[PDB]
């Protein structure tokens, strides 16, 4: 009967990267989406497989909320279908997704002057992601017809990177904050529902 | 013509501190990552240094290393402590490209054995 923690995913002080974005199970409360909806911070809040006024009706089964960073032009890649570093090697979401992406800009909060250097991107892998796979194997592969022997054959690449966050930086790399809900719809007893 | 220090036989109840010094180019932008190989194994990856001093580590060697930098004395340093009898390797300091993830091994490489 009490309020569903998005006080603790939303205004969290430390996201996680992308490449091990964080997963939050939400269960045994009643979530107030209304709240949601109605603030002005989140300047994109998109649903699908549900409506976001309709949100307050529906009792769902284990609600989960994953928060991560990414860069202002890759927001459109949290979606179903959508091709990309982040939907191939990073986050990728199903094509029967029933959800809702919010994303809002926290350049004010996760960069600093001389580069905020702590959120972290997958560059390259050897296939891509499944449908909500954390992929957090730091290697270092090979690539170009020589093995990853030595120095002595073509140099091996580092997948992750590092965004350089800087407040100076234009909009489209600023640092925006995803967090992405997911619902199970009405397999067992509901356990989240709303007022 | 730049060079490397500090490599050297050490005991597994202590520490050692690697250099990586630069030359011929400017070290002052550029992403710079320690790794190692083991004799027989694959590149394992030690760490990285960013710009403005910020560091992200191997979650298998995150309490055990640091790694720190100079720009005005052109130098990378690794600290490593409790070593283990696996953790004799080949460093190597290695500067990482922006947007392909291209590693530029200019050093010769250190040896670092352990025993008693
Ligand atoms: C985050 O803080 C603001 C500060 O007023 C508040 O309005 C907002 O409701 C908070 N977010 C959540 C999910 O509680």
């Known amino acids: ?195 | 013509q730049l060079v490397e220090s500090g490599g050297g036989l050490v005991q597994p109840g202590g520490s050692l501190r690697l250099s990586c010094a630069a030359s011929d180019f400017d070290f002052y932008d550029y992403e710079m990552s320690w790794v190692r190989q083991a004799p027989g194994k694959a590149l394992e990856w030690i760490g990285n240094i960013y710009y403005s001093g910020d560091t992200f580590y191997n979650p298998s060697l995150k309490s055990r290393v640091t790694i720190s930098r100079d720009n005005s004395k052109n130098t990378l340093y690794l600290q490593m402590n409790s070593l283990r009898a696996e953790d004799t390797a080949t460093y190597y300091c290695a500067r990482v490209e922006s947007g392909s993830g291209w590693l530029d091994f200019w050093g010769q490489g250190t040896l670092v054995t352990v025993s008693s």
């Open chain 1, 1 to 195: 009967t009490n309020l569903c923690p998005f006080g603790e995913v939303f205004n969290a002080t430390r996201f996680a990267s992308v490449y091990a974005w964080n997963r939050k199970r939400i269960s045994n409360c009643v979530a107030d989406y209304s709240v949601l909806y109605n603030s002005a911070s989140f300047s994109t809040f998109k649903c699908y497989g549900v409506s976001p006024t309709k949100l307050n009706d529906l009792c769902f089964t284990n609600v989960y909320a994953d928060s991560f960073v990414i860069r202002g032009d890759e927001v459109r890649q949290i979606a179903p279908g959508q091709t990309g570093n982040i939907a191939d090697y990073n986050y990728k979401l199903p094509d029967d997704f029933t959800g809702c992406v919010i994303a809002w800009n926290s350049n004010n909060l996760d960069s600093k002057v001389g580069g905020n250097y702590n959120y972290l991107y997958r560059l390259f892998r050897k296939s891509n992601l499944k449908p909500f796979e954390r992929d957090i194997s730091t290697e270092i592969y090979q690539a170009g017809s020589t093995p990853c022997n030595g120095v002595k054959g073509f140099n091996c690449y580092f997948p992750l990177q590092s965004y350089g966050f800087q407040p100076t930086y234009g909009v489209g790399y600023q640092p925006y904050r995803v967090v992405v809900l997911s619902f199970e719809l009405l397999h067992a007893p509901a356990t989240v529902c709303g007022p």
